[PDB]
Design a protein around this ligand. Structure first.
Ligand SMILES: Nc1ncnc2c1ncn2[C@@H]1O[C@H](COP(=O)(O)OP(=O)(O)NP(=O)(O)O)[C@@H](O)[C@H]1O
Ligand SMILES: Nc1ncnc2c1ncn2[C@@H]1O[C@H](COP(=O)(O)OP(=O)(O)NP(=O)(O)O)[C@@H](O)[C@H]1O
Ligand SMILES: Nc1ncnc2c1ncn2[C@@H]1O[C@H](COP(=O)(O)OP(=O)(O)NP(=O)(O)O)[C@@H](O)[C@H]1O
Lengths: 157, 157, 158
């Protein structure tokens, strides 16, 4: 089993990292697929986001980070993954993932879509929230890895 | 009864199409009112979206297609329609249509708001999803009419 | 003893906002309307204008003040020494976003409470986004907004 965890990860947070720790324990191979997502004007470049996700995850031997800008249903076949991993924090996540799962079932029928929910300690962590707090000088050290905090710190001065 | 089905239809999809076939069977006159929707930066122009919706409903005699860029509560009067038709796919749709209907009740008190839910076969189909998949060269033929599929294909080349 | 801070974008302030302000003024000693600059929303009215509009609609309430701000809300509520946030819940969407924002503020401002009101069903559907879109198309929005705000929309789209 090779699982693919796709997202924008702008930047990667302790919310993502918890899911990755749990996936790392359940599957033989975990690939973090950082989506380019140019139409979201991500705060960080694809290169940095890949780099932060690597730094935050280097300590896990069966976890890899890779960037992509193609259709997710195509990229998963290029990585030879048979499982999608997504996280569910709230009903808006569930609805969207529910629809995307039915959709990817059409585009990539041999790929399962599976979901995890967060630990209550990380259920509320948003990348949009971390970005908006850091841009106004709020402390985001409780929601991200130190390297990411350091990155946010540098990015806004 | 003259029912008015307003939407952005960017582009019209098999989910829209299912609701229209079912409405045409239920009401004497069905108008598809295509909204300009400038705040949505539509992939297609209002003219193309009208042409597409008309092409897809060509075979239904009690169905007409019209473009409009005015307030919906004014346009429905200009069309002398007494019923709104809207679709409900998910809690997100339900919330929004619920708010829009109490709002249209103030602006157009003589117009009913009514809802259909999609066949499970088209429940997951989103216009936004169709657009984002076509933009990355994923096959979207199962979610749209052949003319619409061609129109997406041409739109990114 | 209780100083409550109601933060929002207020673009523009609405009768839905107004009901909550009315109900809160009856409930707390001091009510502060904190209007966020919200540049990331490309607001229709300027901060200066939104503040002024929010003031005109609230002048009849003595324990209510209006102030604009563009700093972090969790810093700003401390700066106002307010001990409770007021937010409104109209629908599941508000509830999710507010639930997530309250847990986040609990981390940034642990001694500030987050509390919620739900709208009277007569203002349940009123949105600033809705009022703006209707006015921009010349609809009558007088039932959703105070006369000063209605006038402000009409002129802004002319
Ligand atoms: N704190 C979290 N806990 C559990 N799952 C999460 C969490 N944050 C993000 N995710 C999930 O993991 C995936 C990747 O997240 P990501 O794409 O970076 O965020 P996003 O959906 O674009 N929105 P945002 O986090 O608000 O910027 C999403 O499917 C999310 O459902
Ligand atoms: N597959 C579908 N089945 C039933 N109703 C739908 C479907 N797709 C869209 N609608 C409904 O038909 C109406 C017009 O939709 P429309 O404005 O074109 O899409 P939208 O509002 O942009 N949503 P989205 O599909 O996320 O792009 C709305 O009432 C919708 O909820
Ligand atoms: N009619 C209303 N009734 C009760 N609370 C409301 C109402 N409208 C807005 N609010 C709440 O008051 C707060 C401030 O709102 P604000 O951000 O300025 O508008 P908004 O939430 O962006 N509305 P909209 O832009 O139309 O989606 C939020 O917690 C809102 O959910």
């Amino acid at each position: 089993n090779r699982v693919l965890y796709p997202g924008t990860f702008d930047p990667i947070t302790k919310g993502h990292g918890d899911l990755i720790e749990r996936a790392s324990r359940l599957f033989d191979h975990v690939i973090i697929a950082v989506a380019a997502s140019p139409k979201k004007n991500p705060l960080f470049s694809l290169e940095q986001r890949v780099a932060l996700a690597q730094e935050v995850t280097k300590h896990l031997p069966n976890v890899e980070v890779v960037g992509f800008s193609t259709l997710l249903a195509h990229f998963v076949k290029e990585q030879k993954a048979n499982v999608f991993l997504r996280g569910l924090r709230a009903v808006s996540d569930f609805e969207y993932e529910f629809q995307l799962a039915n959709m990817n079932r059409q585009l990539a029928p041999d790929v399962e879509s599976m979901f995890l929910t967060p630990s209550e300690k990380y259920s509320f962590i948003s990348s949009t929230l971390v970005r908006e707090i850091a841009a106004l000088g709020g402390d985001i050290s409780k929601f991200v890895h130190p390297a990411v905090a350091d990155a946010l710190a540098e990015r806004f001065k």
